[PDB]
Amino acid sequence: PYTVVYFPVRGRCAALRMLLADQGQSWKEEVVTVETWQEGSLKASCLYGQLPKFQDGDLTLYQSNTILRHLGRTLGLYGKDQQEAALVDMVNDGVEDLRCKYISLIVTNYEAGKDDYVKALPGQLKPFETLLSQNQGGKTFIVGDQISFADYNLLDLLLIHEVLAPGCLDAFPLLSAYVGRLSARPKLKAFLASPEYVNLPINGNGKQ
Template sequence: MPGPFTITYFPLRGRAEAIRMLLSDQGQQWKEDVVTQELWQKGELKKSCLFGQLPKFQDGDLTLYQSNAILRHLARTFGLYGKDLKEATLLDMANDGVEDLRRKYIHLIFQKYDDGKAAYVEALPTELRSFETLLSQNHGGQTFIVGDQISFADYSLVELLHAHLLLAPGCLNAFPLLSAYVERVSARTRLCAFLDSPAHRNRSINGRDKQ
């Protein structure tokens, strides 16, 4: 049996929120070990982290770092990695695309927000079109990003799209499949309860309070 689970991270959504979404949707409980900036700046915790960064994830006696590795571990644990090798490979591809966009988003928020937001939002349709295309190629966009069962890549993509809908509220207007997909996944019973919870709603998106 997997667990118990502990997420060690800042009081943010950030790179841990897709992990939380996956766990909540799969009916799992976890402990939050919240790291303040004051504690992090002391440096001892950072030194103890394998790659000098968070999140840190505990699954019983297994300690993991790197958010995408954590998502993939949980995907294998809960059967969220597609039904065969082809789907697993397509999910890796899709999630790598999510990671590419996430890195651009993080760069904007932490380095280019004041003078780069307008250009970022203007270029965003080019980024989003790839995911609309992926959806259109899978059951006409009526299910998930790959296959007919939810996967780790769906949680990662939907979480990032939630952040972009706050950054640019109309960003999905030109992408009907993607817009409906976000609503459909977010409406899943346990995931919806998590997204409506104070734990999620009160958590800062990125720590910079920029959207």
């Protein structure tokens, strides 16, 4: 019933894939080549002219965070009540903002901008350390005591930043422990080690 339509990349599909794997859900991957993409007709049929496209039976979705929220809702990964749901959105929106900066660097300014970016990174990572510290000493999840879609998205942003700036989480013991703890969940651990995850590059220009 689920189909992910994307480039041969981790990118904006890494978090939703981790979620689906961790939750024991099956899905199909439909891969779009650069050639298919540049021919232009699939792009023309995309709502906002972008991928991922996601299919849930006859429901067609665009926008990676829409997909995340949809699976959160359907799979019960959206907090225990309405106040937790708001906190879950607040984290995800914050994650989305640092991801936009991360993509901008990768695409438009990797070589010249990297140095500056890695320097501003501690200040960008701190709110998430704070959020953990205020949630049972950072011992469980980013919101409440059950996993949410924001957890998968944050885990991913943190994995890719440790690739970009190895040791960037040394400054943040709760975020460091959170990564190890979430990465060690049985289904997720198995998925993160698999060729289907491992043999995809993070980004499409090979920069990371």
